[PDB]
Amino acid sequence: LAAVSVDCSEYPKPACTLEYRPLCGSDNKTYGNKCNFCNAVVESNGTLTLSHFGKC
């Protein structure tokens, strides 16, 4: 109901920047930032979704 989203459309990217702004995936993994999360969503071939912002 929080309708949490990130836009992963410009993905994949060969490189990520190193800031920590964690994202908690539907696989119950913490991704380090949007870039690391989005590269995983394209590599899940779209079945990995966003649970919420922050750590798991």
Partner: protein
């Protein structure tokens, strides 16, 4: 930092933590009493007014009497390019000026366009991830790296830990790379994820920006 080790308390007393309300998000280096340097991409698309700048830290999880906490008054950029990850440096002016003591000191920077060559021995450090889902460090970690020229472009300083899956990870952006005492990079990006053992980590090359740094800090 993946594969490194605990720093000694206040070993690198120019190491700064940048924090938003959830805590640490990037590193920074103290380069004058009222100025810190970081990566441009840490402040892009965040509310700079919310960022607290912590000096004097060692273990982020603990209440430390050592710490000094500022807010950011102004930022200076120099054509950061998010597409190509170029000029990934920022300088933040603090709303005050630090007290210099054993826990907080200003770093030394190289002269303009001094180049490191292939094989130089340096230290990296940071409070980022200890590994793909081992989580963020409490205690400042350091890591011996080597400068590398292969698989790097000329507008970056690159490092690699030979024979180990180690290097910089999320939360170590903006942290220094120190080589013969002087500050040569600002951690900028990875590729293939952290500690791939294949692609070197990329820093922003401070020596390219010293004239610009000087034009701020005197």
């Amino acid at each position: 930092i993946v594969g490194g080790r605990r720093a000694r308390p206040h070993a690198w007393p120019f190491m700064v933590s940048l924090q938003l309300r959830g805590g640490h998000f990037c590193g920074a280096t103290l380069i004058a009493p009222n100025f810190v340097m970081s990566a441009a991409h840490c402040v892009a698309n965040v509310n700079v007014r919310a960022v607290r700048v912590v000096l004097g830290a060692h273990n982020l999880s603990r209440r430390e009497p050592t710490r000094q906490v500022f807010a950011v008054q102004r930022i200076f950029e120099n054509g950061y390019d998010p597409v190509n990850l170029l000029n990934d440096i920022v300088i933040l002016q603090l709303n005050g000026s630090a007290t210099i003591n054993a826990n907080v000191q200003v770093a030394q920077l190289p002269a303009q366009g001094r180049r490191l060559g292939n094989g130089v021995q340096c230290l990296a450090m940071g409070w980022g991830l200890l590994g793909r889902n081992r989580g963020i460090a409490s205690v400042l970690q350091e890591l011996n790296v080597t400068v590398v020229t292969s698989l790097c472009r000329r507008s970056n300083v690159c490092t690699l830990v030979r024979g180990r899956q180690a290097g910089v990870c999320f939360g170590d952006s903006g942290s220094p790379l120190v080589c013969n005492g002087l500050i040569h990079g600002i951690a900028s990006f990875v590729r293939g994820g952290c500690a791939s053992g294949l692609y070197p980590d990329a820093f922003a090359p401070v020596a390219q920006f010293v004239n610009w740094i000087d034009s701020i800090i005197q």
